[PDB]
Enzyme design. Structure first.
Site, mmCIF file in Angstrom:
data_model
loop_
_atom_site.group_PDB
_atom_site.id
_atom_site.type_symbol
_atom_site.label_atom_id
_atom_site.label_comp_id
_atom_site.label_asym_id
_atom_site.label_seq_id
_atom_site.Cartn_x
_atom_site.Cartn_y
_atom_site.Cartn_z
ATOM 1 N N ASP A 266 0.807 -1.223 0.000
ATOM 2 C CA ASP A 266 0.000 0.000 0.000
ATOM 3 C C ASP A 266 0.851 1.290 0.000
ATOM 4 O OD1 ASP A 266 0.774 -0.020 2.674
ATOM 5 O OD2 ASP A 266 -1.238 0.255 3.486
ATOM 6 N N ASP A 450 -17.189 -22.995 31.805
ATOM 7 C CA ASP A 450 -17.926 -21.975 32.538
ATOM 8 C C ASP A 450 -17.095 -21.318 33.636
ATOM 9 O OD1 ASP A 450 -20.376 -20.601 32.514
ATOM 10 O OD2 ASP A 450 -21.121 -21.687 34.270
ATOM 11 N N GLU A 483 -16.494 -18.730 29.007
ATOM 12 C CA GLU A 483 -17.542 -17.767 29.308
ATOM 13 C C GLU A 483 -17.241 -16.276 29.050
ATOM 14 O OE1 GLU A 483 -19.199 -17.849 33.335
ATOM 15 O OE2 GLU A 483 -20.973 -16.747 32.672
ATOM 16 N N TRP A 986 -31.861 -42.326 45.017
ATOM 17 C CA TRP A 986 -32.653 -41.160 44.620
ATOM 18 C C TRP A 986 -33.873 -40.856 45.458
ATOM 19 C CZ3 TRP A 986 -30.124 -38.737 40.636
ATOM 20 C CH2 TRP A 986 -29.223 -39.512 39.898
HETATM 21 MN MN LIG Z 1 -35.371 -43.706 46.708
HETATM 22 MN MN LIG Z 2 2.047 -1.681 3.899
#
Ligand SMILES: [Mn+2]
Ligand SMILES: [Mn+2]
Ligand SMILES: [Mn+2]
Ligand SMILES: [Mn+2]
Length: 1348
Positions: A266, A450, A483, A986
């Site tokens: 350039d 995260d 994150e 559970w």
């Molecule tokens: Mn249970």
């Molecule tokens: Mn240049």
């Protein structure tokens, strides 16, 4: 000074023999760049500067491209005795300086298990090494630096001229470029040094500064030289418990320079030339080469055991997005892929959600999804953990300086901080990623890390820690994503707070730097995109920037059309731009003299002195992006033109990224790449994407390879793929396109085939989610009956049924003899039953039904919650289950049906067939429920037979299946006072939903049907934090306050309680039970801080549910008939003060019992049922009666007091107007005698009996006349008050007004028509009253009624 020469075809480098220093770089054209011109021989070890002498350095030229140095680095006083081996290599215009060996004479290495290495070499640097330098005496001498900025108003760059006044000492940057005398260079280093930043809300590798700039006097000129920032070798770290460790280097020290001339041609030599060369030496994030292909980013979410998005559903959604984008690449982040969902099971990376289909289904989704260009990755956390996680231990626990837990966030469970330093140094985290690697192999694309950098794991989380974290991940073949916008500059390819522009505001977005974006735009989605309310960098960036939306439950986002619209608005052009590398960037309006950017490139011969960026690919294609004006007050500031090889391919203003203003941008983008490695596709596959924001007609010049075509094929893109094909004529290499507003089109050179999609692979049915359009009801699902079956909904498509209709499909790939659960989402608006049935041959294997749905959906991450409008602005979708054994013949069929002929709708979605071992339902011979048991050990998903209620509205509900991990999940560990699990592995857990005064969860008839009039024994095991904070709720139909029967539960903290009650089935078959949150405040037992949450004082755990039908005493027809008489004799006279719906419920029930009693051929079973239904009706009406008597007593109290507000509040909450007490006194009697005109008129309007009398025969007119209230007496006679009404003596309101002696009240009632002939039991008129009292004033008005 004695030197040697290293040579390439591009340059010759003169190097010193006494130290690893460059004297100069001489390029082929003769241009020269300086190194270190002065005698500087400094080595820093552990912060101590040591100057080397001639005998401390040995040299060896290995070849014309390489030299080796041996450095004796000793300081006896500072405990330093080392031998450093340095390698200098050259290739093309690059020079590399590597530390290939470090020998420590003061240690035997790192002790086993990362023990402390005494006299370890922790840091290493070459202070003021000046590997490259520029002088104030050189033409256009300049410096360009970059530092981290997440702030849209503050650029991270600096651009200044190098003058005699330039004075810097170890000035640290992420990137540093020096230019002068027609050459430019940047310095690269792998240094993990943390330093100066512009703006960042977090650590986590945000502050990584790898270049050091220092000035020195070079004769009569000022020389500015570049050096590497310090490297870490064997670093000593301490964990939260005070235990010290030594950890080996992430990599050995490395640095490099790449000498550039006028690279972009350039006519000027600046940092941009240096930056083009620098790409050949810089580190590149692992898998950054696939970033341009990731057009469709999104999150598929799972939360609280609900399995909102099982892996095989996520795969169907990939195929939907593939059809709609014509196969563009995707990147799906699986948030809640593991354990029970999102923010459950951290940090057990290898525990893939069993309720989503486990590793098997995750691999099927990843393998099949890759065929559509879809990449997958998982959300992990290395900063917070929950007691349920198997990795949870005392060593893993982060502790404060006082010895207590470092608490995280409480939601489903209490999060505890992970000791980050321990997790790294012990090899714990690396082993957990290894657990994940065993499950996924090489199928998974990325990791999403995260919170890293927010100081939850330690007060450090520096670039050294983040570098090691990214290495563990990259080592398993995973691309790094994280994150925070500013986080992990070295290795991340995506930041959620950069790509999702809505979060955190203008100070906390992506990387605001021209230098960083010039270099790496094509490698990351870590920049600033359009979000004009943030201003600066966020106001129409030319390079665009990823704008991320979702439709699979993340933050309740479930809008598919908005997701697709947004992809075409911002992401297609951003991704197109990422297929090119920046070569030139001029006239940047963000950079000024005031923000330290006086030397920033400013060309008035380019785009009228307004902003322009040129980009190029390795094939010589050129992209040019131009801003209309650099003035933010101009309409042209937001105008962007894009050219591809000099031809306009995009023009206009994008719709604001903040959703505040639609734009006018139209484009015709050539998509030349495949969705895999991004290679050029063949001619028949080359295509153009068309978009017109406002809609209308636009004319375009086609790319050069299309200039001789006579026509093109245009297809409109939908969720069904390529539709409404059009042949458009090409004249003079140009095409005219007519487009609807915000509608995607794809242009081909000829006829293009449809993308093949086989819906619901591995799901045992074809098109389980009803994504196949109307056609799915033709060859996938078979429809039969008088009614109609439609695919309905423009967002998440559902099956809609009206009238008598059946939708069937054969089940495939079942394991003969294996137990399966089949569940389907159902929303029934009809009174007629909606059903799910599994058949083999003709035989019914299992069946279930639902009447009118009674529970709204409150699951935020779910596709059909009550905010998604299934019909009439609500959604009642709840999963309906059938349990069956796969038949030996291998012939099984599912049928979705609607029985009644009414016009109301029934909606079905997501047919899920899953291997399941639950067997706790036993039936009677007639198919009704005998018993239901549940220990919640084999739940397919959710809290079945319960469903989550509205205590939190549409939320990521603080209710889920709790998991055992002793001793951590048990009472007694730390400040924990309640067990998470009652028995087995559970239980159902409620976390801190106290003082709500509403329902928390409940059963629904489709899960547990309580037959009309039938009795049931209901029992469960429980643990409650405080007394009366939670209660057992019993109701009929949709939950409503006041209508519910409540039983407060006592505290069971650490010791399991037993709850037992009897439930009688409501007359309409819609009875249910659940857990209710009362108004009572918990007993926190003196706990403070997080201990109030962790303690369990506010929680409720349930397990071992048992429902058993109780046998009823058999009744005769006579008994049932007599019971009808009894019920009618009690409630027929109570229609007035009873709701219109309550009277309908009562009448419907009597009809129901009479049908059973009077049917020709009725049996003892029918007579028992009829009798039992009436007994249930009685208890229902009686409970409603005591709630009405409560409201009536409070209305008689407020009638006395005289408060209009409390009289109106009670009346609006259902209060009886004509309600009388034990002596027959109504609220109209009370309000009239006290004289509350505002209440008397409110009562009379509401329908209060004006003629009503008490046990003394006194009407509200008698009372008001004796008291002397003129205004009250007036309105009573105007509402029909009996003028000649009498008491138990015979006193008319004329007699009583005379007895009290009211001069103005006697004359008023006479005018209306009060009798003067009236006499009581004693035979006394008004003549006797006026002569008895001392006042003759009454006798004057009576002689003006009749003159004596
Ligand atoms: Mn249970
Ligand atoms: Mn240049
Ligand atoms: Mn669907
Ligand atoms: Mn849990």
């Amino acid at each position: 000074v004695a030197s040697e020469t290293l040579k390439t075809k591009k340059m010759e480098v003169q190097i010193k023999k006494n130290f690893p220093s460059v004297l100069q770089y001489t390029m082929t054209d003769g241009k020269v760049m300086y190194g270190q011109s002065k005698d500087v021989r400094t080595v820093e070890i552990n912060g101590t500067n040591i100057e080397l002498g001639d005998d401390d350095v040995t040299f060896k030229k290995v070849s014309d491209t390489e030299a080796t140095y041996t450095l004796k680095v000793k300081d006896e006083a500072k405990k330093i005795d080392a031998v450093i081996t340095v390698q200098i290599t050259v290739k093309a215009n690059q020079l590399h300086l590597n530390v290939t060996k470090i020998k420590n004479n003061l240690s035997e290495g790192i002790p086993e298990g990362n023990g402390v290495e005494e006299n370890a070499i922790q840091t290493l640097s070459f202070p003021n090494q000046s590997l490259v330098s520029v002088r104030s005496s050189q033409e256009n001498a300049q410096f360009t630096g970059a530092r981290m900025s997440s702030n849209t108003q503050k650029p991270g760059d600096t651009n200044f001229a190098v003058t005699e006044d330039t004075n810097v000492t170890d000035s640290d940057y992420t990137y540093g470029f020096i230019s002068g005398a027609g050459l430019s260079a940047g310095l690269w280093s792998n240094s993990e040094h943390d330093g100066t930043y512009v703006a960042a809300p977090v650590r986590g590798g945000s502050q990584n500064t790898r270049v050091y700039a220092t000035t020195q006097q070079t004769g009569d000129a000022t020389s500015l030289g570049l050096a590497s920032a310090p490297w870490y070798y064997h670093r000593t770290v301490t964990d939260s418990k005070g235990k010290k460790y030594t950890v080996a280097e992430t990599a050995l020290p490395q640095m490099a320079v790449a000498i550039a001339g006028d690279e972009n041609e350039d006519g000027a030599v600046n940092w941009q030339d240096g930056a083009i060369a620098y790409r050949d030496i810089m580190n590149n994030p692992y898998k950054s080469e696939e970033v341009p292909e990731l057009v469709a980013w999104r999150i598929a979410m799972n939360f609280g055991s609900q399995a909102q998005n099982p892996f095989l559903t996520t795969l169907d959604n990939v195929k939907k997005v593939a059809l709609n984008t014509d196969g563009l690449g995707q990147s799906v982040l699986l948030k809640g892929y593991g354990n029970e969902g999102h923010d459950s099971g951290h940090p057990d990376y290898g525990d893939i959600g069993q309720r989503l289909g486990g590793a098997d289904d995750m691999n099927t989704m990843m393998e099949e999804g890759s065929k559509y260009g879809a990449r997958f990755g998982v959300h992990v956390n290395a900063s917070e953990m929950y007691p349920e996680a198997k990795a949870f231990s005392e060593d893993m626990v982060r502790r404060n300086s006082a010895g207590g837990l470092s608490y995280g966030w409480n939601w489903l469970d209490q999060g505890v901080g992970i000791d980050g330093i321990y997790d790294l140094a012990s090899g714990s985290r690396v082993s957990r990623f290894a657990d994940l690697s065993k499950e996924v192999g090489d199928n998974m694309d990325f990791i999403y890390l995260d919170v890293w950098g927010n100081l939850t794991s330690s007060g450090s989380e520096d670039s050294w820690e983040t570098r090691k974290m990214s290495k563990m991940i990259n080592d398993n073949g995973w691309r790094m994503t994280t994150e925070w916008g500013s986080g992990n500059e070295y290795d991340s390819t995506f930041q959620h707070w950069a790509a999702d522009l809505t979060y955190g505001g203008y100070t906390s977005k992506g990387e605001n730097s021209e230098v960083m974006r010039f270099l790496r735009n094509h490698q990351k989605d870590s920049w600033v995109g359009d979000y004009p309310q943030y201003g600066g960098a966020a106001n129409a960036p030319l390079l665009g920037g990823y704008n991320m939306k979702d439709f699979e439950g993340w933050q309740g986002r479930n809008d598919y059309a908005a997701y697709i619209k947004n992809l075409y608005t911002h992401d297609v052009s951003t991704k197109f731009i990422q297929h090119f590398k920046v070569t030139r960037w001029v006239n940047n309006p963000l950079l000024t003299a005031d923000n330290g950017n006086a030397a920033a490139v400013s060309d008035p011969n380019t785009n009228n002195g307004n902003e322009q960026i040129t980009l190029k690919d390795s094939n010589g294609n050129v992209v040019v992006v131009s801003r209309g004006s650099n003035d933010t007050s101009s309409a042209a500031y937001r105008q962007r033109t894009i050219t591809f090889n000099g031809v306009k391919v995009a023009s206009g203003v994008v719709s604001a990224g903040d959703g505040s203003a639609t734009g006018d941008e139209s484009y015709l983008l050539p998509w030349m790449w495949d969705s895999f490695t991004g290679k050029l596709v063949k001619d028949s596959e080359q295509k153009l994407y068309h978009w017109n924001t406002k809609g209308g007609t636009t004319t375009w010049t086609l790319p050069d390879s299309w200039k001789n075509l006579s026509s093109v094929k245009v297809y409109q893109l939908t969720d069904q793929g390529k539709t409404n094909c059009q042949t458009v004529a090409v004249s003079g290499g140009k095409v005219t396109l007519t487009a609807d507003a915000e509608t995607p089109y794809v242009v081909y050179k000829g006829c293009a085939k449809q993308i093949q999609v086989n819906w619901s692979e591995g799901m045992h049915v074809v098109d389980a989610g009803f994504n196949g359009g109307s056609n799915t009801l033709t060859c996938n699902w078979t429809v039969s009956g008088s009614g109609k079956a439609e695919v309905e909904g423009d967002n998440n498509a559902m099956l809609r049924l009206t009238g008598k209709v059946d939708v069937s499909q054969r089940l495939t790939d079942l394991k003969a003899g294996q137990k399966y659960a089949l569940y389907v989402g159902v929303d029934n608006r009809s009174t007629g039953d909606a059903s799910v049935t599994v058949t083999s041959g003709g035989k019914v294997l299992a069946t279930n039904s639902t009447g009118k749905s009674i529970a709204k959906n409150y699951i935020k991450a779910y596709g059909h919650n009550t905010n998604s409008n299934t019909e009439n602005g609500s959604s009642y979708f709840q999963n309906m289950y059938v349990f069956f054994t796969a038949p030996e013949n291998g012939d099984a069929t599912v049928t979705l049906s609607h029985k009644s002929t009414d016009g109301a709708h029934t909606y079905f979605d997501d047919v899920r067939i899953v291997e399941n071992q639950y067997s706790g339902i036993t039936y009677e011979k007639d198919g009704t429920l005998k018993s239901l048991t549940n220990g919640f050990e084999n739940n397919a998903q959710g809290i079945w037979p319960f469903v989550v209620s509205g205590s939190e509205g549409v939320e990521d509900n603080r209710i889920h299946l709790s998991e055992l991990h002793a001793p951590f999940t048990r009472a007694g560990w730390d400040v924990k006072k309640m067990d998470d699990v009652l028995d087995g592995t559970w239980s159902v857990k409620v976390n801190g939903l106290t003082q709500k005064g509403t329902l928390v969860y409940q059963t629904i008839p489709q899960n547990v049907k309580f037959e009309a009039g039938a009795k049931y024994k209901v029992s469960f095991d429980y643990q409650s934090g405080s007394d009366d904070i939670y209660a057992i709720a019993v109701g009929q139909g949709e939950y409503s306050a006041g209508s519910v029967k409540l039983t407060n539960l006592k505290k069971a903290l650490g010791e399991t309680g037993k709850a037992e009650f009897e439930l009688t089935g409501g007359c309409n078959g819609d009875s249910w039970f659940g857990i209710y949150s009362t108004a009572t405040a918990p007993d926190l037992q003196g706990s403070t801080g997080n201990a109030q949450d962790f303690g369990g004082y506010k929680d409720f755990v349930l397990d071992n549910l048992k429902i058993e039908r109780i046998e009823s005493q058999t009744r005769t027809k006579a008994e049932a008939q007599d019971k009808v008489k009894e019920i009618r004799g009690k409630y027929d006279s109570k229609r007035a003060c009873l709701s219109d719906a309550a009277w309908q419920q009562y009448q419907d029930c009597l009809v129901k019992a009479r049908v059973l009693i009077n049917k020709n051929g009725a049996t003892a079973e029918d007579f028992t049922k009829a009798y039992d239904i009436l007994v249930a009706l009685d208890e229902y009406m009686k409970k409603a009666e005591r709630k009405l008597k409560d409201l009536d007593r409070k209305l008689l109290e407020a009638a006395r007091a005289g408060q209009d507000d409390e009289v109106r509040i009670l009346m609006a909450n259902g209060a009886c107007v004509n309600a009388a007490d034990d002596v027959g006194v109504t609220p109209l009697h009370l309000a009239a005698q006290r004289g509350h005109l505002e209440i008397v008129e409110v009562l009379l309007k509401c329908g209060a009996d004006v003629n009503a009398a008490d046990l003394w025969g006194q009407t509200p007119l008698h009372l008001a006349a004796t008291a002397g209230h003129l205004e009250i007496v007036e309105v009573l006679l105007c509402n029909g008050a009996d003028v000649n009404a009498r008491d138990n003596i015979g006193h008319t309101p004329l007699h009583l007004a005379a007895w009290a002696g009211h001069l103005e009240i006697v004359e008023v009632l006479l005018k209306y028509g009060a009798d003067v002939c009236a006499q009581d039991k004693f035979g006394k008129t008004a003549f006797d009253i006026s002569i008895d009292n001392g006042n003759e004033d009454l006798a004057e008005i009576l002689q003006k009624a009749c003159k004596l």
